[PDB]
Amino acid sequence: KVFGRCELAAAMKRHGLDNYRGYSLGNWVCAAKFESNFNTQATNRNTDGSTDYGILQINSRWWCNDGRTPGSRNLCNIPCSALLSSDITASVNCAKKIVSDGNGMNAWVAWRNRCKGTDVQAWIRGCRL
């Protein structure tokens, strides 16, 4: 599923991401924009052989099981395929664990490089929330 901007903001809010670990909704929408362009089915292979999955490009090295990432963990206790669903529940629940891991949203390199410190509220501007 490719979400609209405000559609994703509302879904993220419904699932409790707004201000989770102190990160406003716009931070989450911005991260999703640059990780996946709001496409739940986005995947990307990393140089190390791990794969990133879904709207927030969650990596198989630590967070999900895809059966083809040697020496990896599955800390969200889910198949990586669950991160590609039109229902963002699995992605949100796993993102909550990731953002709680110690480095906040810096876990998402694209957030650090493209969202951090910017006017992230623009991502939810106009949205009925």
By CB under 5 A, tell whether 2 contacts Cl ion: no
101 carries a ligand binding annotation? yes
Q: State the nearest-atom distance from the C-beta of 91 to Na ion, in Å.
A: 15
Binders of Na ion among residues 30 to 89 (CB under 5 A) are 60, 65, 69, 72, 74
Closest approach of Cl ion to the CB of residue 62, in Å: 8
Q: Under the criterion CB under 5 A, does residue 95 sit at the interface with Cl ion?
A: no
What is the three-class DSSP state of 43?
Answer: strand
User: E strands of 1-129, at which residues?
Assistant: 43-45, 51-53, 58-59
Q: Using the rule CB under 5 A, is 65 a contact of Cl ion? A: yes
3-state secondary structure of 13: helix
Instruction: Determine, following the binding rule CB under 5 A, whether residue 88 of this chain makes contact with Cl ion.
Output: yes
Closest CA to 56 of 14, 119, 6, 3: 3
Helix (H) or strand (E) holding 98: helix 89-99
Length reported for the chain: 129
Q: Which two tokens stand for residue 77?
A: 């206790």
- Closest residue to Cl ion, based on beta-carbon distance: 26
Q: Which does 83 bind (CB under 5 to 8 A by kind): Cl ion, Na ion, none?
A: none
Interacting residues toward Cl ion by CB under 5 A: 5, 11, 24-26, 65, 69, 72-74, 79, 87-88, 104, 120-121
Interacting residues toward Na ion by CB under 5 A: 60, 65, 69, 72, 74
